Amino acid sequence: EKNVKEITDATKEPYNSVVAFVGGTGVVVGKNTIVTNKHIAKSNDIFKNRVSAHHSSKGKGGGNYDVKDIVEYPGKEDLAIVHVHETSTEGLNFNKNVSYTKFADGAKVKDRISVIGYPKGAQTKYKMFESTGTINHISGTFMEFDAYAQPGNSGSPVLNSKHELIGILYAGSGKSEKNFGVYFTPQLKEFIQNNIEK
């Protein structure tokens, strides 16, 4: 499917749970806590760059926050928890500027979904886009779906028709409307929830 539209004002739910990292996307799931791919969290710990809360071309900025630490999922699944320092260098409070996305507790093949993130962010001044499609396959912690996705979408939340979080994108395929995600099973949900700051 190729139905991709810019979210010009991402201060509204659920767009204000989406965050931009230099080369990808993450989603806020609880107090000071973001989910994204492993390499996005990791390569960010080399330059120690900030994460921007819901950057969009027209929306009031949500702040740019420093990373406190990362917790990688132990398994091979491409999932990492990123904790941020609650107060930005500009005195903005992360929790006042984002929302926490709720879990879907799974999905089904043929479900209609949205992938929201920053495709080609370094070429667009980090415009947020939502891309719609359908879940084509679910197995274990793997899912495939056909929403158009590009470089910049790794870590993007995949949402259901009620704006709840099913998983996150981790990869495309070939030369992309056949894209792969981490599908959140109870085990991955429990991993995430156990690692939200109290």
From Swiss-Prot:
Q: Which Cys pairs does UniProt list as disulfide-bonded? A: none
Its induction note reads: Positively regulated by agr (accessory gene regulator).
A GO-annotated cellular component: extracellular region
Tell me which residues this entry annotates as catalytic. H39 (charge relay system), D78 (charge relay system), S154 (charge relay system)
GO BP field: proteolysis
Q: What is its main location?
A: secreted
Under the heading InterPro entries, the entry gives: Peptidase_S1_PA, Peptidase_S1_PA_chymotrypsin, Peptidase_S1B, Peptidase_S1B_tx, Trypsin_dom, V8_his_AS
- Annotated localization: Secreted
Q: Which PROSITE patterns match?
A: V8_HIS
Cite the GO molecular-function annotations of the record. Answer: serine-type endopeptidase activity
* Keyword terms of this UniProt record: Hydrolase, Protease, Secreted, Serine protease, Signal
- E.C. designation(s): 3.4.21.-
Which top-level group of life is the source organism from?
Bacteria
Quote any Pfam family the record assigns. Answer: Trypsin
User: What is this enzyme's class at the first EC digit?
Assistant: hydrolase
For this chain, the family text in UniProt reads: Belongs to the peptidase S1B family.
Name the chain's protein: Serine protease SplA
Q: Which organism is this protein's natural source?
A: Staphylococcus aureus (strain NCTC 8325 / PS 47)
Gene name of the record: splA
